[PDB]
Amino acid sequence: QQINEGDFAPDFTVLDNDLNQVTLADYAGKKKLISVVPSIDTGVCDQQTRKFNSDASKEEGIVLTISADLPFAQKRWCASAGLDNVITLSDHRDLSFGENYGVVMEELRLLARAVFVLDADNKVVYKEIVSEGTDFPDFDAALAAYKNI
Amino acid sequence: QQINEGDFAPDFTVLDNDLNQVTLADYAGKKKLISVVPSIDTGVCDQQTRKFNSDASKEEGIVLTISADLPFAQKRWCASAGLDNVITLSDHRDLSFGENYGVVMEELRLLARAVFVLDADNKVVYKEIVSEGTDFPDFDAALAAYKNI
Protein backbone atom coordinates (compact mmCIF):
# COMPACT_ATOMS: atom_id res chain seq x y z
CA GLN A 1 0.00 0.00 0.00
CA GLN A 2 1.24 3.50 0.97
CA ILE A 3 3.09 4.21 4.24
CA ASN A 4 2.11 7.36 6.07
CA GLU A 5 4.12 9.07 8.76
CA GLY A 6 2.51 8.49 12.14
CA ASP A 7 1.34 5.01 11.21
CA PHE A 8 2.67 1.87 12.75
CA ALA A 9 5.14 0.16 10.35
CA PRO A 10 3.88 -3.05 8.72
CA ASP A 11 5.77 -6.25 9.35
CA PHE A 12 7.76 -7.98 6.64
CA THR A 13 9.79 -11.11 6.00
CA VAL A 14 13.28 -10.81 4.48
CA LEU A 15 16.48 -12.88 4.43
CA ASP A 16 19.79 -12.21 6.20
CA ASN A 17 23.12 -13.02 4.63
CA ASP A 18 22.97 -16.45 6.26
CA LEU A 19 19.57 -17.30 4.69
CA ASN A 20 17.66 -16.88 7.94
CA GLN A 21 14.20 -15.29 7.97
CA VAL A 22 14.19 -11.78 9.54
CA THR A 23 11.08 -9.79 10.51
CA LEU A 24 10.62 -6.38 12.12
CA ALA A 25 10.32 -8.10 15.55
CA ASP A 26 13.96 -9.29 15.34
CA TYR A 27 14.83 -5.65 16.13
CA ALA A 28 12.30 -5.27 18.94
CA GLY A 29 12.73 -2.27 21.14
CA LYS A 30 15.13 -0.42 18.79
CA LYS A 31 14.70 2.59 16.57
CA LYS A 32 15.42 1.85 12.90
CA LEU A 33 16.67 3.72 9.92
CA ILE A 34 15.61 1.67 6.91
CA SER A 35 17.58 2.45 3.77
CA VAL A 36 16.09 0.91 0.61
CA VAL A 37 18.11 0.59 -2.60
CA PRO A 38 17.67 -0.87 -6.13
CA SER A 39 21.06 -2.63 -5.89
CA ILE A 40 24.01 -2.45 -3.51
CA ASP A 41 26.15 -3.35 -6.56
CA THR A 42 25.57 0.16 -8.01
CA GLY A 43 27.67 3.15 -7.02
CA VAL A 44 25.01 5.55 -5.75
CA CYS A 45 23.41 2.76 -3.63
CA ASP A 46 26.83 1.77 -2.23
CA GLN A 47 27.42 5.36 -1.18
CA GLN A 48 23.99 5.63 0.45
CA THR A 49 24.62 2.38 2.38
CA ARG A 50 28.04 3.48 3.62
CA LYS A 51 26.94 6.94 4.64
CA PHE A 52 23.87 5.95 6.68
CA ASN A 53 25.90 3.22 8.39
CA SER A 54 28.82 5.58 9.27
CA ASP A 55 26.71 8.57 10.29
CA ALA A 56 23.96 6.88 12.40
CA SER A 57 24.62 6.11 16.10
CA LYS A 58 24.52 2.30 16.23
CA GLU A 59 24.93 2.30 19.97
CA GLU A 60 21.51 3.98 20.00
CA GLY A 61 19.46 2.18 17.24
CA ILE A 62 19.71 -0.03 14.04
CA VAL A 63 20.43 0.84 10.33
CA LEU A 64 18.74 -1.72 7.98
CA THR A 65 19.66 -1.93 4.31
CA ILE A 66 16.91 -3.65 2.21
CA SER A 67 17.15 -4.53 -1.51
CA ALA A 68 16.20 -7.14 -4.11
CA ASP A 69 19.88 -8.19 -4.40
CA LEU A 70 20.29 -11.88 -3.60
CA PRO A 71 21.59 -12.65 -0.09
CA PHE A 72 24.80 -13.84 -1.73
CA ALA A 73 25.42 -10.41 -3.38
CA GLN A 74 24.80 -8.62 -0.12
CA LYS A 75 27.20 -10.93 1.80
CA ARG A 76 29.87 -10.44 -0.87
CA TRP A 77 29.36 -6.65 -0.73
CA CYS A 78 29.96 -6.48 3.03
CA ALA A 79 33.13 -8.61 2.68
CA SER A 80 34.38 -6.51 -0.26
CA ALA A 81 33.76 -3.28 1.67
CA GLY A 82 35.61 -4.75 4.68
CA LEU A 83 32.70 -3.91 7.01
CA ASP A 84 31.27 -6.51 9.53
CA ASN A 85 28.96 -3.99 11.25
CA VAL A 86 26.54 -3.42 8.35
CA ILE A 87 23.12 -5.11 8.27
CA THR A 88 21.86 -6.05 4.81
CA LEU A 89 18.60 -7.91 4.18
CA SER A 90 17.29 -9.35 0.91
CA ASP A 91 13.69 -8.97 -0.25
CA HIS A 92 14.30 -11.06 -3.39
CA ARG A 93 12.04 -14.00 -2.68
CA ASP A 94 8.66 -12.41 -2.08
CA LEU A 95 9.04 -8.61 -2.19
CA SER A 96 7.36 -8.81 1.23
CA PHE A 97 9.04 -5.62 2.37
CA GLY A 98 8.68 -3.79 -0.97
CA GLU A 99 4.93 -4.52 -1.34
CA ASN A 100 4.21 -3.69 2.32
CA TYR A 101 6.15 -0.38 2.06
CA GLY A 102 5.00 0.57 -1.48
CA VAL A 103 8.51 0.74 -3.01
CA VAL A 104 8.48 -1.84 -5.77
CA MET A 105 9.52 -0.74 -9.23
CA GLU A 106 7.21 -3.23 -10.92
CA GLU A 107 8.69 -3.09 -14.43
CA LEU A 108 12.22 -3.74 -12.98
CA ARG A 109 11.43 -6.11 -10.05
CA LEU A 110 13.70 -3.83 -8.00
CA LEU A 111 13.06 -1.68 -4.94
CA ALA A 112 12.92 2.13 -5.35
CA ARG A 113 15.46 4.22 -3.51
CA ALA A 114 13.80 5.25 -0.24
CA VAL A 115 14.25 5.91 3.48
CA PHE A 116 11.99 5.18 6.48
CA VAL A 117 12.73 6.01 10.10
CA LEU A 118 10.88 4.06 12.77
CA ASP A 119 10.89 4.84 16.44
CA ALA A 120 11.30 2.15 19.09
CA ASP A 121 7.53 1.46 18.84
CA ASN A 122 7.69 1.07 15.05
CA LYS A 123 6.02 4.44 14.59
CA VAL A 124 6.99 5.87 11.22
CA VAL A 125 8.58 9.28 12.07
CA TYR A 126 10.22 9.90 8.63
CA LYS A 127 9.70 8.86 5.00
CA GLU A 128 11.41 9.77 1.66
CA ILE A 129 10.83 8.03 -1.65
CA VAL A 130 13.67 9.46 -3.68
CA SER A 131 12.39 11.53 -6.58
CA GLU A 132 13.13 11.30 -10.28
CA GLY A 133 16.30 13.29 -11.02
CA THR A 134 17.47 13.64 -7.40
CA ASP A 135 21.11 12.92 -6.68
CA PHE A 136 20.82 11.18 -3.26
CA PRO A 137 18.27 10.77 -0.40
CA ASP A 138 18.23 13.62 2.18
CA PHE A 139 20.83 12.08 4.58
CA ASP A 140 20.63 14.93 7.04
CA ALA A 141 16.81 14.96 7.36
CA ALA A 142 16.63 11.19 7.95
CA LEU A 143 19.59 11.25 10.33
CA ALA A 144 18.01 14.06 12.32
CA ALA A 145 14.72 12.11 12.63
CA TYR A 146 16.68 9.09 13.83
CA LYS A 147 18.87 11.07 16.27
CA ASN A 148 15.78 12.91 17.70
CA ILE A 149 14.13 9.69 18.92
CA GLN B 1 7.93 -28.59 -16.43
CA GLN B 2 10.23 -30.95 -17.92
CA ILE B 3 12.61 -30.68 -20.84
CA ASN B 4 14.04 -34.03 -21.84
CA GLU B 5 16.85 -35.06 -24.12
CA GLY B 6 15.59 -35.00 -27.73
CA ASP B 7 13.05 -32.22 -27.04
CA PHE B 8 13.48 -28.80 -28.57
CA ALA B 9 14.86 -25.95 -26.56
CA PRO B 10 12.18 -23.47 -25.31
CA ASP B 11 12.47 -19.72 -25.82
CA PHE B 12 13.33 -17.38 -23.00
CA THR B 13 13.73 -13.75 -22.17
CA VAL B 14 16.59 -12.77 -19.86
CA LEU B 15 18.76 -9.75 -19.18
CA ASP B 16 22.39 -9.14 -20.05
CA ASN B 17 24.70 -7.30 -17.72
CA ASP B 18 23.65 -3.97 -19.13
CA LEU B 19 19.89 -4.71 -18.74
CA ASN B 20 19.29 -5.39 -22.40
CA GLN B 21 16.71 -8.15 -23.12
CA VAL B 22 18.26 -11.34 -24.57
CA THR B 23 16.35 -14.29 -26.10
CA LEU B 24 17.10 -17.67 -27.63
CA ALA B 25 17.21 -16.11 -31.08
CA ASP B 26 20.19 -13.93 -30.20
CA TYR B 27 22.31 -17.12 -30.34
CA ALA B 28 20.91 -18.48 -33.60
CA GLY B 29 23.07 -20.71 -35.69
CA LYS B 30 25.34 -21.87 -32.82
CA LYS B 31 25.51 -24.88 -30.53
CA LYS B 32 25.05 -23.93 -26.81
CA LEU B 33 26.25 -25.15 -23.42
CA ILE B 34 23.82 -23.67 -20.91
CA SER B 35 25.13 -23.72 -17.33
CA VAL B 36 22.49 -22.89 -14.69
CA VAL B 37 23.44 -21.84 -11.15
CA PRO B 38 21.69 -20.73 -7.94
CA SER B 39 24.12 -17.78 -7.62
CA ILE B 40 27.45 -16.84 -9.17
CA ASP B 41 28.31 -15.26 -5.76
CA THR B 42 28.80 -18.72 -4.21
CA GLY B 43 31.98 -20.69 -4.45
CA VAL B 44 30.62 -23.92 -6.05
CA CYS B 45 28.80 -21.87 -8.72
CA ASP B 46 31.87 -19.67 -9.39
CA GLN B 47 33.85 -22.85 -10.02
CA GLN B 48 31.11 -24.37 -12.30
CA THR B 49 31.08 -21.12 -14.35
CA ARG B 50 34.82 -20.95 -14.73
CA LYS B 51 35.19 -24.61 -15.58
CA PHE B 52 32.60 -24.78 -18.41
CA ASN B 53 33.96 -21.52 -19.79
CA SER B 54 37.61 -22.65 -19.77
CA ASP B 55 37.07 -26.23 -20.95
CA ALA B 56 34.51 -25.67 -23.78
CA SER B 57 35.76 -24.48 -27.18
CA LYS B 58 34.25 -21.04 -27.88
CA GLU B 59 35.58 -21.31 -31.39
CA GLU B 60 33.01 -24.15 -31.27
CA GLY B 61 29.71 -22.78 -29.85
CA ILE B 62 28.34 -20.47 -27.04
CA VAL B 63 28.64 -21.10 -23.25
CA LEU B 64 25.76 -19.39 -21.36
CA THR B 65 25.61 -18.89 -17.56
CA ILE B 66 22.09 -18.26 -16.27
CA SER B 67 21.00 -17.44 -12.72
CA ALA B 68 18.49 -15.39 -10.74
CA ASP B 69 21.37 -13.07 -9.63
CA LEU B 70 20.71 -9.45 -10.40
CA PRO B 71 22.36 -8.16 -13.60
CA PHE B 72 24.42 -5.85 -11.37
CA ALA B 73 25.98 -8.81 -9.47
CA GLN B 74 26.77 -10.63 -12.71
CA LYS B 75 28.35 -7.46 -14.15
CA ARG B 76 30.42 -6.99 -11.00
CA TRP B 77 31.48 -10.69 -11.01
CA CYS B 78 32.71 -10.51 -14.62
CA ALA B 79 34.49 -7.22 -13.92
CA SER B 80 36.17 -8.35 -10.70
CA ALA B 81 37.13 -11.71 -12.25
CA GLY B 82 38.74 -9.97 -15.24
CA LEU B 83 36.63 -12.25 -17.47
CA ASP B 84 35.43 -10.34 -20.56
CA ASN B 85 34.61 -13.51 -22.56
CA VAL B 86 32.11 -15.02 -20.07
CA ILE B 87 28.37 -14.55 -20.94
CA THR B 88 26.23 -14.16 -17.85
CA LEU B 89 22.46 -13.65 -18.05
CA SER B 90 19.88 -12.80 -15.36
CA ASP B 91 16.52 -14.53 -15.11
CA HIS B 92 15.64 -12.45 -11.95
CA ARG B 93 12.77 -10.45 -13.33
CA ASP B 94 10.26 -13.07 -14.53
CA LEU B 95 11.96 -16.54 -14.21
CA SER B 96 11.26 -16.91 -17.98
CA PHE B 97 14.20 -19.25 -18.52
CA GLY B 98 13.83 -21.23 -15.21
CA GLU B 99 10.07 -21.81 -15.73
CA ASN B 100 10.45 -22.73 -19.41
CA TYR B 101 13.34 -25.17 -18.67
CA GLY B 102 11.76 -26.61 -15.46
CA VAL B 103 14.65 -25.61 -13.13
CA VAL B 104 13.15 -23.22 -10.55
CA MET B 105 13.59 -24.15 -6.90
CA GLU B 106 10.23 -22.59 -6.17
CA GLU B 107 10.54 -22.48 -2.36
CA LEU B 108 13.75 -20.31 -2.73
CA ARG B 109 13.05 -18.43 -5.99
CA LEU B 110 16.44 -19.54 -7.29
CA LEU B 111 17.51 -21.71 -10.21
CA ALA B 112 18.67 -25.23 -9.63
CA ARG B 113 22.18 -26.21 -10.67
CA ALA B 114 21.61 -27.73 -14.16
CA VAL B 115 23.28 -28.15 -17.60
CA PHE B 116 21.69 -28.25 -21.01
CA VAL B 117 23.53 -28.83 -24.26
CA LEU B 118 21.85 -27.71 -27.43
CA ASP B 119 22.85 -28.41 -31.01
CA ALA B 120 22.75 -25.60 -33.62
CA ASP B 121 19.06 -26.31 -34.37
CA ASN B 122 18.21 -26.18 -30.66
CA LYS B 123 17.61 -29.87 -30.09
CA VAL B 124 18.46 -30.68 -26.48
CA VAL B 125 21.14 -33.42 -26.80
CA TYR B 126 22.17 -33.55 -23.13
CA LYS B 127 20.58 -32.58 -19.82
CA GLU B 128 21.56 -32.84 -16.14
CA ILE B 129 19.65 -31.34 -13.25
CA VAL B 130 22.15 -31.84 -10.43
CA SER B 131 20.71 -33.97 -7.58
CA GLU B 132 20.27 -32.40 -4.10
CA GLY B 133 23.47 -32.96 -2.05
CA THR B 134 25.70 -34.09 -4.94
CA ASP B 135 28.91 -32.07 -5.04
CA PHE B 136 29.04 -30.89 -8.72
CA PRO B 137 27.49 -31.53 -12.19
CA ASP B 138 29.11 -34.13 -14.46
CA PHE B 139 31.40 -31.69 -16.26
CA ASP B 140 32.99 -34.36 -18.42
CA ALA B 141 29.73 -35.79 -19.77
CA ALA B 142 28.30 -32.39 -20.65
CA LEU B 143 31.57 -31.26 -22.27
CA ALA B 144 31.76 -34.48 -24.23
CA ALA B 145 28.17 -34.01 -25.47
CA TYR B 146 29.05 -30.42 -26.46
CA LYS B 147 32.29 -31.33 -28.21
CA ASN B 148 30.61 -34.21 -30.10
CA ILE B 149 28.18 -31.89 -31.93
Side-chain angles (χ1 to χ4, degrees):
Chain A
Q1 206 119 309
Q2 195 226 324
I3 302 293
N4 322 300
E5 298 98 321
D7 301 337
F8 290 107
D11 220 326
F12 58 89
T13 302
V14 295
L15 300 152
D16 75 19
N17 293 351
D18 300 323
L19 295 217
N20 299 296
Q21 196 136 10
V22 171
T23 69
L24 190 43
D26 281 290
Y27 308 95
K30 312 254 148 48
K31 63 172 180 187
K32 308 94 169 172
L33 192 157
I34 304 186
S35 179
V36 186
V37 297
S39 175
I40 209 174
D41 272 327
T42 69
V44 49
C45 299
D46 186 307
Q47 289 182 276
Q48 177 177 334
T49 298
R50 287 175 175 263
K51 182 165 181 57
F52 281 137
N53 267 280
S54 293
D55 282 10
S57 172
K58 281 135 96 216
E59 270 325 300
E60 269 67 296
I62 296 298
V63 174
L64 305 180
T65 293
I66 308 186
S67 70
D69 295 290
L70 291 190
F72 313 108
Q74 304 183 313
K75 189 175 189 70
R76 178 213 48 79
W77 185 88
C78 290
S80 289
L83 299 170
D84 61 11
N85 67 341
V86 168
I87 302 170
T88 55
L89 308 174
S90 168
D91 206 21
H92 89 90
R93 190 183 287 178
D94 296 319
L95 304 170
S96 169
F97 171 81
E99 290 178 346
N100 293 347
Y101 285 66
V103 293
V104 181
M105 302 192 291
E106 313 92 332
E107 317 93 277
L108 306 182
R109 209 181 180 276
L110 292 178
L111 301 191
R113 293 198 283 175
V115 188
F116 303 88
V117 179
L118 281 47
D119 81 7
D121 293 326
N122 288 327
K123 193 103 59 153
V124 180
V125 300
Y126 178 87
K127 172 180 159 201
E128 186 182 12
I129 292 181
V130 182
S131 305
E132 287 228 3
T134 282
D135 66 336
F136 283 96
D138 191 338
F139 301 97
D140 287 344
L143 288 167
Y146 178 89
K147 166 166 195 140
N148 262 12
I149 290 164
Chain B
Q1 218 183 54
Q2 197 219 124
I3 305 317
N4 302 313
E5 304 198 354
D7 308 353
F8 297 113
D11 198 9
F12 56 72
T13 302
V14 294
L15 295 169
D16 74 20
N17 289 355
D18 293 333
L19 285 268
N20 304 305
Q21 291 185 342
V22 178
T23 69
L24 180 60
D26 288 329
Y27 305 104
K30 277 312 186 88
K31 78 176 172 189
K32 300 95 170 163
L33 198 153
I34 306 175
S35 173
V36 186
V37 298
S39 167
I40 216 79
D41 276 320
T42 66
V44 143
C45 299
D46 188 313
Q47 292 183 266
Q48 174 174 333
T49 301
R50 293 177 176 273
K51 180 155 184 343
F52 284 127
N53 270 282
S54 66
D55 289 5
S57 181
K58 301 165 140 170
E59 192 86 33
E60 249 173 29
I62 290 285
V63 180
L64 301 179
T65 292
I66 316 190
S67 73
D69 292 299
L70 304 187
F72 316 109
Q74 295 187 328
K75 184 179 195 181
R76 178 259 300 154
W77 183 93
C78 282
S80 294
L83 286 180
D84 67 356
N85 59 344
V86 175
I87 307 296
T88 58
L89 310 167
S90 177
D91 205 21
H92 79 104
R93 197 177 300 210
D94 310 310
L95 298 166
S96 174
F97 171 84
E99 290 186 351
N100 296 357
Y101 287 63
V103 293
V104 182
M105 299 191 296
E106 300 225 333
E107 81 283 20
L108 310 168
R109 208 183 181 269
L110 299 174
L111 304 193
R113 293 190 299 160
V115 182
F116 296 88
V117 172
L118 282 47
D119 68 23
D121 296 330
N122 289 330
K123 203 175 62 265
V124 173
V125 302
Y126 179 81
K127 167 183 178 244
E128 190 184 12
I129 310 169
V130 179
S131 56
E132 182 186 6
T134 288
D135 71 334
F136 284 98
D138 186 347
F139 292 103
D140 288 342
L143 289 167
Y146 178 87
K147 173 87 205 279
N148 177 263
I149 287 170

